Design a binder for this molecule. Structure first.
Ligand SMILES: O=P(O)(O)OC[C@H]1O[C@H](O[C@H]2O[C@H](CO)[C@@H](O)[C@H](O)[C@H]2O)[C@H](O)[C@@H](O)[C@@H]1O
Ligand SMILES: [Mg+2]
Length: 307
């Protein structure tokens, strides 16, 4: 379990920080889980909060989501300083650019047809189920199927994917909130976080929030930068160039990339899961609802206006 996010302690750290890495999951984190995937549109207050955070040059703000780049662009593309990571770190659109860096170019993607065929099979035989073919991942939804037959069908599809496909393909099979998803094995939200840390060695405050099991990759990455027993004394925390950085480059470029000394210390990392106190997680904190994640920064933002 975890203590509830100490917004007081976080507020003061936020004010003292020179460079802040702010990482937000989307679904279930910045916006509630709802019936229909395309209906998960950010509220006015939510859009305003993230905007203000991007307005600050001290902040480096990213969304890290399993969503497709199109959906993310549609609702967030209007914020010039907001970075976007789509489909579990298979794509990355920095605040500067306008196009997504394909993190999967060097990966074997021949598995997509096989997975699509399987999900089509179950979509046709599971009323209310839907399929979401994305650019580097595929999601099968059953949230609007019959409660019982949906889970049953889910277990059968899962068993088929795990028994006959996973063991021979570079994929990971994700059990999401009333969905199944298949992604490339070599990418995850954790690698994106590490890429971002490598890019910004001057970060002295990290916030990261997520509601799903896939977000635990982020929480783990935010821990394993430090030695298993915590940093000892005033030792330098050094970080090698991560896979999410090197795989995009050419071997000549990669050979030139140096190790970096990170400014961040564990006390500066606020890893927050969305869920109940009892939820077992690698995050250091929790908040019960996505709405409280937003309100935390709304209250914080208002306080910044004063002084
Ligand atoms: O990584 P995030 O930003 O959380 O999204 C990953 C996952 O999320 C979406 O599905 C979920 O949210 C919708 C909207 O509330 C629900 O209807 C689904 O039941 C949830 O599973 C995306 O649509 C998926 O493609 C993606 O895998
Ligand atoms: Mg989520």
């Amino acid at each position: 379990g975890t203590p509830a996010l100490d917004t007081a302690q976080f507020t003061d750290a936020y004010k003292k920080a020179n460079k802040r890495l702010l990482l937000f999951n989307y679904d279930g984190t910045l916006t509630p889980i709802v019936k229909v995937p395309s209906h998960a549109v950010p509220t006015e207050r939510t859009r305003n909060a993230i905007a203000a955070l991007c307005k600050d040059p001290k902040n480096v703000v990213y969304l890290i989501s399993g969503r497709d780049g199109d959906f993310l662009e549609e609702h967030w593309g209007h914020l010039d300083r907001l970075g976007l990571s789509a489909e579990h770190g298979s794509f990355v659109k920095q605040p500067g650019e306008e196009d997504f860096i394909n993190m999967t170019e060097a990966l074997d993607m021949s598995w997509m047809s096989e997975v699509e065929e399987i999900f089509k099979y179950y979509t046709e035989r599971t009323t209310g189920s839907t399929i979401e073919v994305k650019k580097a991942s595929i999601t099968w939804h059953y949230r609007n199927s019959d409660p019982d037959f949906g889970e049953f069908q889910c277990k059968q599809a899962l068993d088929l994917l795990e028994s006959s496909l996973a063991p021979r393909r570079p994929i990971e099979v994700l059990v999401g909130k009333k969905n199944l998803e298949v992604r490339p094995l070599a990418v995850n939200k954790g690698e994106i976080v590490r890429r971002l840390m490598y890019e910004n060695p001057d970060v002295d405050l990290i916030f990261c929030a997520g509601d799903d099991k896939t977000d635990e990759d982020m929480f783990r990455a935010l821990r394993t930068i430090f030695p298993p027993g915590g940093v000892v004394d005033n030792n330098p925390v050094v970080m090698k160039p991560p896979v999410a950085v090197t795989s995009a480059l050419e071997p000549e470029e990669v050979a030139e990339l140096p190790d970096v000394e990170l400014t961040i210390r564990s006390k500066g990392v606020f890893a927050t899961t969305v869920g109940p106190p009892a939820k077992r997680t690698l995050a250091g904190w929790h908040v019960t609802c996505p709405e409280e994640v937003v309100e935390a920064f709304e209250s914080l933002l208002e306080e910044i206006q004063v002084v």
